[PDB]
Design an enzyme around this catalytic site. Structure first.
Site, PDB file in Angstrom:
ATOM      1  N   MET A   9       3.469   5.760 -11.608  1.00 15.66           N
ATOM      2  CA  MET A   9       2.384   6.731 -11.466  1.00 15.66           C
ATOM      3  C   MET A   9       1.251   6.432 -12.412  1.00 15.66           C
ATOM      4  O   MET A   9       1.436   6.523 -13.637  1.00 15.66           O
ATOM      5  CB  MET A   9       2.884   8.156 -11.755  1.00 15.66           C
ATOM      6  CG  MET A   9       3.819   8.699 -10.708  1.00 15.66           C
ATOM      7  SD  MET A   9       4.332  10.355 -11.150  1.00 15.66           S
ATOM      8  CE  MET A   9       5.605  10.028 -12.325  1.00 15.66           C
ATOM      9  N   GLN A  77       5.004  -2.545 -13.196  1.00 10.60           N
ATOM     10  CA  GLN A  77       4.374  -2.619 -11.887  1.00 10.60           C
ATOM     11  C   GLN A  77       2.942  -3.170 -11.953  1.00 10.60           C
ATOM     12  O   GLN A  77       2.084  -2.642 -12.659  1.00 10.60           O
ATOM     13  CB  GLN A  77       4.431  -1.301 -11.090  1.00 10.60           C
ATOM     14  CG  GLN A  77       3.985  -1.574  -9.631  1.00 10.60           C
ATOM     15  CD  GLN A  77       3.699  -0.363  -8.818  1.00 10.60           C
ATOM     16  OE1 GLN A  77       2.737   0.364  -9.077  1.00 10.60           O
ATOM     17  NE2 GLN A  77       4.519  -0.138  -7.798  1.00 10.60           N
ATOM     18  N   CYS A 106      -0.038   1.548  -2.195  1.00  9.72           N
ATOM     19  CA  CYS A 106      -1.268   2.240  -2.612  1.00  9.72           C
ATOM     20  C   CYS A 106      -2.327   2.339  -1.520  1.00  9.72           C
ATOM     21  O   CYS A 106      -2.974   1.330  -1.227  1.00  9.72           O
ATOM     22  CB  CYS A 106      -1.860   1.629  -3.881  1.00  9.72           C
ATOM     23  SG  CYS A 106      -3.292   2.537  -4.538  1.00  9.72           S
ATOM     24  N   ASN A 200      12.166   7.000  -1.517  1.00 12.04           N
ATOM     25  CA  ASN A 200      11.048   7.636  -2.187  1.00 12.04           C
ATOM     26  C   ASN A 200      10.202   8.465  -1.218  1.00 12.04           C
ATOM     27  O   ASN A 200      10.099   8.130  -0.045  1.00 12.04           O
ATOM     28  CB  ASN A 200      10.205   6.568  -2.907  1.00 12.04           C
ATOM     29  CG  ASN A 200       8.989   7.090  -3.600  1.00 12.04           C
ATOM     30  OD1 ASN A 200       7.884   6.785  -3.193  1.00 12.04           O
ATOM     31  ND2 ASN A 200       9.162   7.886  -4.656  1.00 12.04           N
ATOM     32  N   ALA A 228       8.530  10.690  -8.134  1.00 13.78           N
ATOM     33  CA  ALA A 228       7.196  10.738  -8.736  1.00 13.78           C
ATOM     34  C   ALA A 228       6.748  12.165  -9.108  1.00 13.78           C
ATOM     35  O   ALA A 228       6.928  12.557 -10.263  1.00 13.78           O
ATOM     36  CB  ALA A 228       6.152  10.031  -7.876  1.00 13.78           C
TER      37      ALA A 228
HETATM   38  C1  LIG Z   1      -0.201  10.846 -10.086  1.00 16.09           C
HETATM   39  C2  LIG Z   1       0.337   9.806  -9.128  1.00 16.09           C
HETATM   40  C3  LIG Z   1      -0.014   8.467  -9.296  1.00 16.09           C
HETATM   41  C4  LIG Z   1       0.495   7.460  -8.464  1.00 16.09           C
HETATM   42  N1  LIG Z   1       0.346   6.122  -8.863  1.00 16.09           N
HETATM   43  C5  LIG Z   1       1.070   5.212  -8.249  1.00 16.09           C
HETATM   44  C6  LIG Z   1       1.215   3.868  -8.891  1.00 16.09           C
HETATM   45  O1  LIG Z   1       0.811   3.547 -10.014  1.00 16.09           O
HETATM   46  N2  LIG Z   1       2.033   2.997  -8.185  1.00 16.09           N
HETATM   47  C7  LIG Z   1       2.709   3.290  -7.001  1.00 16.09           C
HETATM   48  O2  LIG Z   1       3.275   2.363  -6.404  1.00 16.09           O
HETATM   49  N3  LIG Z   1       2.657   4.570  -6.471  1.00 16.09           N
HETATM   50  C8  LIG Z   1       1.890   5.479  -7.067  1.00 16.09           C
HETATM   51  N4  LIG Z   1       1.986   6.784  -6.664  1.00 16.09           N
HETATM   52  C9  LIG Z   1       2.880   7.138  -5.541  1.00 16.09           C
HETATM   53  C10 LIG Z   1       4.257   7.563  -6.047  1.00 16.09           C
HETATM   54  O3  LIG Z   1       4.848   6.518  -6.821  1.00 16.09           O
HETATM   55  C11 LIG Z   1       5.179   7.987  -4.902  1.00 16.09           C
HETATM   56  O4  LIG Z   1       5.345   6.899  -4.008  1.00 16.09           O
HETATM   57  C12 LIG Z   1       4.763   9.219  -4.094  1.00 16.09           C
HETATM   58  O5  LIG Z   1       4.262  10.245  -4.956  1.00 16.09           O
HETATM   59  C13 LIG Z   1       5.889   9.746  -3.228  1.00 16.09           C
HETATM   60  O6  LIG Z   1       7.003  10.132  -4.063  1.00 16.09           O
HETATM   61  P1  LIG Z   1       7.235  11.671  -4.501  1.00 16.09           P
HETATM   62  O7  LIG Z   1       7.414  12.440  -3.201  1.00 16.09           O
HETATM   63  O8  LIG Z   1       8.543  11.645  -5.285  1.00 16.09           O
HETATM   64  O9  LIG Z   1       6.080  12.195  -5.283  1.00 16.09           O
HETATM   65  C14 LIG Z   1       1.324   7.826  -7.386  1.00 16.09           C
HETATM   66  C15 LIG Z   1       1.637   9.171  -7.188  1.00 16.09           C
HETATM   67  C16 LIG Z   1       1.192  10.161  -8.059  1.00 16.09           C
HETATM   68  C17 LIG Z   1       1.683  11.579  -7.875  1.00 16.09           C
HETATM   69 CL   LIG Z   2       2.420   5.148  -2.251  1.00 12.63          CL
END
Ligand SMILES: Cc1cc2nc3c(=O)[nH]c(=O)nc-3n(C[C@H](O)[C@H](O)[C@H](O)COP(=O)(O)O)c2cc1C
Ligand SMILES: [Cl-]
Ligand SMILES: [Cl-]
Length: 317
Positions: A9, A77, A106, A200, A228
């Site tokens: 994140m 990452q 992303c 995820n 996340a």
């Molecule tokens: C604040 C925030 C920043 C994110 N930054 C990234 C990142 O650096 N790399 C990545 O692969 N996914 C990023 N994501 C996506 C999350 O890793 C994740 O795939 C997504 O939130 C779904 O999972 P969750 O339902 O558990 O939140 C980000 C999500 C959030 C909430």
């Molecule tokens: Cl994502």
């Protein structure tokens, strides 16, 4: 047992949160996505004052900060669209991290994250170069494609590169958090592959407490779960015994933020993400007005802790 993983994140995934997630039971912690074009400019610096390993850019900014506590559990990452740049970054940080990950999900320069999914030839080249070039386990985090046949064709090709595991966010490039996660597509991927599949995309809709994590892992037939938003909201999501009050959690977070000289705007951001509705409280207003780490500690009754810690770090500097 099955692994509890802190999802990568941006801004959230700095060192204080990674250590706090480890304290509450996370087995593996991913750092925020860091762009290859920025990391290639960095120098590895041993920081004696903080007991950290820093990766410093020519403008003296610390891009990545790690410590011995997370050395065997941290996954780096990177954001990349170039195989040679990806390997150069991997070689810079390999001795200080436990794994190397490539962002391939992303939706947010271009050619990276979800943009890679339409270029499987480039994904293949990046992953095979990394796998052969580092002794560390290589992983990638992806998003699903519009077609299941195309999603399955892609994951089979990714697996053939020799990667250790694949994290699957069960949402398509265009799908926002309001759209439900596809448990069936992660299940179809988990059933098809021989390598571990990290499920995820389950935060809020499926994961609100600790017990929900195993329920999500069973729904998707995955090897492990990556969390996340639920961890961003409350890092004690990883704790088997149940959620700790946010009062308790924010105290521990700020202590790490001070001990590891975390930038105050980053500490403020992560606390704001934990508070949400509690931002309208007197404490949330003092946090909002805070213009330094001292002011953050003052808002949380850690002014004395701040003074003792920073004076002890000023002496050894
Ligand atoms: C604040 C925030 C920043 C994110 N930054 C990234 C990142 O650096 N790399 C990545 O692969 N996914 C990023 N994501 C996506 C999350 O890793 C994740 O795939 C997504 O939130 C779904 O999972 P969750 O339902 O558990 O939140 C980000 C999500 C959030 C909430
Ligand atoms: Cl994502
Ligand atoms: Cl000050």
């Amino acid at each position: 047992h099955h692994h509890l993983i802190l999802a990568p994140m941006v801004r959230v995934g700095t060192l204080p949160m990674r250590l706090l997630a480890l304290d509450y039971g996370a087995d593996i912690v991913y750092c925020e996505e860091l762009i290859d074009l920025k990391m290639i400019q960095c120098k590895r610096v041993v920081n004696e004052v903080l007991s950290t390993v820093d990766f410093v850019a020519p403008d003296d900014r610390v891009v990545f900060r790690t410590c011995e506590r997370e050395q065997n559990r941290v996954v780096f990452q990177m954001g990349t669209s170039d195989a040679e740049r990806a390997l150069a970054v991997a070689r810079l940080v390999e001795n200080d991290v436990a794994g190397i990950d490539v962002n391939m999900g992303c939706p947010k320069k271009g050619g990276m994250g979800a943009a890679l999914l339409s270029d499987p030839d480039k994904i293949e080249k990046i992953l095979s170069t990394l796998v052969k070039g580092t002794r560390r386990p290589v992983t990638c985090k992806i998003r699903i494609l519009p077609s299941l046949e195309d999603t399955l064709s892609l994951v089979k090709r990714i697996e053939r590169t020799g990667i250790a595991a694949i994290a699957v966010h069960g949402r398509k490039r265009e799908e926002r958090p309001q759209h439900p996660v596809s448990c069936e597509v992660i299940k179809a991927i988990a059933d098809t592959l021989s390598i571990p599949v990290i499920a995820n995309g389950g935060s809020h809709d499926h994961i609100q407490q600790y017990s929900d994590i195993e329920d999500f892992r069973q729904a998707t037939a995955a090897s492990s779960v990556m969390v996340a938003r639920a961890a961003m909201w409350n890092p004690s999501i990883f704790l088997k015994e149940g959620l700790r009050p946010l009062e308790e959690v924010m105290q521990k977070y700020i202590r790490y933020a001070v001990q590891y000289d975390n930038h105050y705007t980053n500490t403020k951001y992560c606390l704001c993400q934990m508070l949400r509705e509690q931002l309208k409280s007197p404490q949330g207003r003092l946090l909002h007005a805070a213009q330094s780490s001292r002011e953050i500690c003052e808002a949380f009754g850690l002014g004395a802790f701040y003074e003792e810690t920073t004076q002890e770090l000023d002496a050894q500097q």
